[PDB]
Amino acid sequence: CMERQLEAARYRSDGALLLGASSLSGRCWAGSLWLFKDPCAAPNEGFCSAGVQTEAGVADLTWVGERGILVASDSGAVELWELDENETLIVSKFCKYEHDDIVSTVSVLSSGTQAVSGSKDICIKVWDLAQQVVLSSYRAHAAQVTCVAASPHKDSVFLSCSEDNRILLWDTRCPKPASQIGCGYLPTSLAWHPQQSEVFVFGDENGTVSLVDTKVLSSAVHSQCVTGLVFSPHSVPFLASLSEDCSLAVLDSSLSELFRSQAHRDFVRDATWSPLNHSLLTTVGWDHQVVHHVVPT
Amino acid sequence: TVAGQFEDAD
Amino acid sequence: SSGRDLNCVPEIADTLGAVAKQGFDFLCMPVFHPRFKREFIQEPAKNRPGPQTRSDLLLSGRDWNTLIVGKLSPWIRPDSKVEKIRRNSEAAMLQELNFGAYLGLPAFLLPLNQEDNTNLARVLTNHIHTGHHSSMFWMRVPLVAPEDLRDDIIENAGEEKTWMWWHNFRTLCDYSKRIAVALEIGADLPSNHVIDRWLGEPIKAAILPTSIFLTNKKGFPVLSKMHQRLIFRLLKLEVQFIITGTNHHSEKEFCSYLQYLEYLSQNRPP
């Protein structure tokens, strides 16, 4: 049986669906990861394509290609699992305890051979997956790192947000790699516009979503802290936002609400547009529900 | 145990 | 006289046994899951069914009273600027403190990371005046504020402030004897006067992150010749130590981090 609370739900180009879940209450606090060839079948453990247990909770995960998951563990570890050739087992590749606290999130740089992570130890670290070692570490923030987002357009650049009202852009290619970008209330989630080089959106704890250019336009969309943002795969994105109000809001390019849903009965924890039909959504929250929304577009 | 196991670093 | 301060506990029995085998004698664990945020006002989140925390039957009553030390959830911000966040933080803090008392934890850790904690003091005093004398309240506080320790990596962009934070908190709580300090040691140390003043406080525990340990020729972890003075002066105070972090010296076992700390104690000046 799988742990109740789903933590993340990430699609892959083929169409499979990877659900990382953890049991935040009860006797055991372990975690697990599941892979479904047919997303609709989930979360029934019997219909899962593959699955495995992990020693500690899965704070956040991310695909690293056609096979490979970079899992962030609350045990202060950054694990890398790799699926078998036939995609029947989730094998482990390496686990590194290089953080002194829970790892909030991890992202994969555009090149795909490197990754980044930030922890509640107010520290960020950049990893090389092939060398399975840490290249650089930065205690730039003065508080716990809340979110990290690698640029999908150009390599070696990423955004970081912390609980000290700082939004730092990074460029490791040059000395003094960190800058500061601002407009307020603490940032809580970040996303990069996929079809634009330097336009990115960030949410604040009050439920307001703002659109900024690296070289601001805001809207009140939620009544509580935004937990994530995921741009749509279309040629004209349809940014989707979820918050602790147990609500989903799909917005236009001008941050005007276009569709809303409340099928979840608890915290919505992740959403991801399907890569087979751009109209299908797929959201998971701690209510142990996986909901597919036919967003109008 | 090891000679200098607690010896001070430079 | 040492603790591990683990922020992840897959299974309580396993973690406790492993920590005991490493030479420690008490464990600093989170009573609630650090990431299990809870809502207390707005539906439907307030109706979250099922258990909210591991049952207390897992350990004998004596075990809770002596070996475990609670830690407040990291997502609780009583002094936040958002009213809903503030109320959620207050409710969560009260619930966690009440659960800690129910278990009978000898000590409980609370973090200080911001210059304003008036609401936290209010909540803590409201809790203290309930009538249970079971537990103390260690207040984590660093020597150097994070804002003064950042690596100066940003391009776009006074040491007593931490003691000012401690003083304001303890005066808000009316010098209650149940409030003690859990001084946290950073890589760099402040001037001699700051530490001398800091040693005049009721420090009950000291936190030594593994990140501050140097490396000896052989390879085992070791402290610098200036940290030794502070450790000795604390030992004179008979303060408890809490080795936190991970095995930065991966080659050696975590037990080493503590064995060295014993070498100082048995080599203390006569």
Side-chain angles (χ1 to χ4, degrees):
Chain A
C1 175
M2 91 175 307
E3 291 73 20
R4 184 150 154 80
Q5 290 80 11
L6 296 307
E7 296 278 31
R10 197 132 288 117
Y11 262 102
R12 87 175 184 178
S13 306
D14 171 12
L17 180 120
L18 172 96
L19 298 169
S22 297
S23 46
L24 305 184
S25 186
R27 168 198 197 71
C28 183
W29 288 21
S32 55
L33 309 101
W34 305 81
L35 177 64
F36 301 80
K37 299 334 183 54
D38 187 359
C40 314
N44 269 19
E45 299 93 312
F47 303 144
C48 78
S49 312
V52 75
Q53 205 174 350
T54 166
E55 301 285 54
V58 173
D60 187 303
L61 55 82
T62 282
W63 278 111
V64 192
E66 304 312 301
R67 43 182 45 103
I69 309 75
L70 201 134
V71 173
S73 178
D74 39 351
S75 61
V78 160
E79 295 157 0
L80 185 79
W81 312 77
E82 307 194 0
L83 313 197
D84 206 359
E85 68 85 21
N86 36 46
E87 304 188 1
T88 60
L89 323 161
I90 302 208
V91 171
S92 177
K93 196 60 38 171
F94 72 78
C95 177
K96 298 291 179 62
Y97 304 90
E98 295 300 323
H99 287 272
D100 304 302
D101 205 357
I102 291 69
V103 177
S104 265
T105 181
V106 304
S107 186
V108 175
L109 309 189
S110 66
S111 47
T113 57
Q114 299 187 32
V116 63
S117 68
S119 148
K120 279 176 212 1
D121 62 1
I122 84 178
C123 180
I124 283 181
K125 297 211 158 59
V126 85
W127 306 74
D128 185 304
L129 310 209
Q131 300 299 340
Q132 78 182 284
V133 291
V134 174
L135 297 318
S136 303
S137 179
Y138 310 115
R139 182 151 281 112
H141 292 300
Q144 79 177 52
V145 184
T146 282
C147 191
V148 185
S151 182
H153 222 52
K154 163 178 52 44
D155 198 8
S156 79
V157 164
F158 59 92
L159 289 186
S160 57
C161 87
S162 165
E163 259 200 8
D164 58 1
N165 184 270
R166 282 202 189 118
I167 328 187
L168 317 177
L169 191 141
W170 294 78
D171 181 341
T172 64
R173 305 202 330 298
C174 291
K176 187 56 56 192
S179 297
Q180 183 151 298
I181 318 297
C183 64
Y185 293 168
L186 280 50
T188 177
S189 266
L190 306 168
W192 276 76
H193 193 291
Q195 311 292 304
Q196 293 185 300
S197 86
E198 72 289 38
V199 173
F200 76 91
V201 297
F202 77 92
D204 56 17
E205 30 196 345
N206 167 55
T208 312
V209 180
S210 298
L211 171 76
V212 191
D213 179 350
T214 305
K215 338 321 311 182
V216 317
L217 178 278
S218 66
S219 179
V221 156
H222 286 292
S223 61
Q224 206 170 12
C225 160
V226 176
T227 298
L229 294 175
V230 180
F231 273 105
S232 86
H234 309 76
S235 48
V236 175
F238 278 133
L239 165 62
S241 64
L242 60 174
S243 60
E244 305 176 90
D245 292 306
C246 320
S247 48
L248 212 32
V250 185
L251 302 83
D252 206 308
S253 51
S254 73
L255 293 214
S256 301
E257 185 187 282
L258 168 60
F259 168 83
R260 207 179 187 89
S261 185
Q262 298 177 318
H264 282 279
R265 280 176 300 90
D266 206 336
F267 294 1
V268 197
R269 207 73 198 166
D270 255 359
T272 45
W273 299 74
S274 158
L276 280 303
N277 181 11
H278 310 73
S279 68
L280 286 169
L281 193 45
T282 303
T283 58
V284 302
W286 294 358
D287 63 352
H288 201 74
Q289 290 200 116
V290 184
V291 208
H292 301 300
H293 308 275
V294 281
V295 53
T297 49
Chain B
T1 70
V2 191
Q5 164 168 4
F6 305 126
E7 186 279 342
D8 228 310
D10 299 17
Chain C
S1 68
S2 325
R4 185 60 180 69
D5 167 26
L6 294 174
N7 215 285
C8 94
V9 303
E11 188 153 28
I12 294 304
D14 170 15
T15 54
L16 191 86
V19 164
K21 287 316 302 183
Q22 287 170 346
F24 300 97
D25 62 343
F26 75 94
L27 173 55
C28 260
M29 51 165 298
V31 288
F32 281 58
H33 199 303
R35 313 185 293 107
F36 188 61
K37 292 170 73 208
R38 305 187 299 288
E39 168 58 6
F40 296 88
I41 314 91
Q42 184 153 220
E43 80 304 348
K46 55 171 275 290
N47 310 324
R48 187 175 295 154
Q52 299 47 18
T53 280
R54 48 168 52 100
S55 317
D56 58 41
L57 296 173
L58 298 173
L59 295 173
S60 75
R62 299 176 70 269
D63 174 12
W64 290 111
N65 245 335
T66 65
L67 306 185
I68 306 305
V69 172
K71 313 166 60 187
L72 190 74
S73 309
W75 60 267
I76 286 170
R77 324 290 313 173
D79 60 29
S80 182
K81 310 307 183 186
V82 178
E83 197 212 8
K84 294 182 184 179
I85 295 285
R86 173 158 57 198
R87 289 187 187 195
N88 285 343
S89 292
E90 291 198 15
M93 174 138 177
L94 282 169
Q95 182 191 336
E96 268 155 39
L97 294 168
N98 274 275
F99 201 86
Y102 174 28
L103 295 176
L105 309 185
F108 202 99
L109 278 158
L110 300 88
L112 283 178
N113 61 71
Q114 151 169 43
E115 101 307 350
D116 184 357
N117 311 276
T118 310
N119 209 42
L120 198 150
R122 200 215 82 218
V123 172
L124 189 55
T125 303
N126 292 7
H127 173 68
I128 278 170
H129 283 307
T130 279
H132 68 292
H133 307 291
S134 34
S135 63
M136 303 262 287
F137 288 122
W138 301 354
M139 303 289 315
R140 162 194 289 291
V141 66
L143 267 293
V144 178
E147 181 45 67
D148 291 62
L149 189 154
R150 54 193 208 66
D151 318 327
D152 190 8
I153 292 299
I154 295 139
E155 174 272 359
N156 284 126
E159 292 189 343
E160 302 193 292
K161 64 172 65 64
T162 53
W163 182 87
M164 201 56 28
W165 302 349
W166 163 241
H167 180 57
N168 289 348
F169 195 51
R170 79 173 175 173
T171 186
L172 266 300
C173 272
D174 203 298
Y175 294 170
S176 212
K177 64 178 180 179
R178 293 184 66 185
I179 304 268
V181 185
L183 176 166
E184 192 282 347
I185 308 204
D188 160 33
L189 303 182
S191 153
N192 296 303
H193 271 155
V194 185
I195 175 175
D196 215 330
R197 172 162 36 65
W198 252 123
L199 279 19
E201 298 316 74
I203 67 200
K204 289 282 184 161
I207 299 154
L208 308 175
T210 52
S211 48
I212 86 189
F213 284 68
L214 290 55
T215 313
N216 179 359
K217 139 175 159 183
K218 189 62 59 163
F220 305 115
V222 79
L223 291 177
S224 75
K225 62 174 150 297
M226 70 223 77
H227 290 115
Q228 280 171 2
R229 316 173 196 296
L230 170 47
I231 295 301
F232 280 126
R233 202 103 57 77
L234 286 191
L235 259 204
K236 285 301 314 310
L237 253 296
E238 301 257 1
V239 86
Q240 299 287 16
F241 290 95
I242 320 184
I243 309 183
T244 179
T246 192
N247 303 34
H248 293 100
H249 299 71
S250 63
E251 290 72 17
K252 319 298 186 172
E253 310 83 8
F254 199 96
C255 154
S256 61
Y257 280 129
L258 186 137
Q259 280 166 353
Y260 176 75
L261 216 161
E262 175 277 352
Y263 179 69
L264 294 181
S265 187
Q266 162 295 343
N267 292 90
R268 72 172 71 183

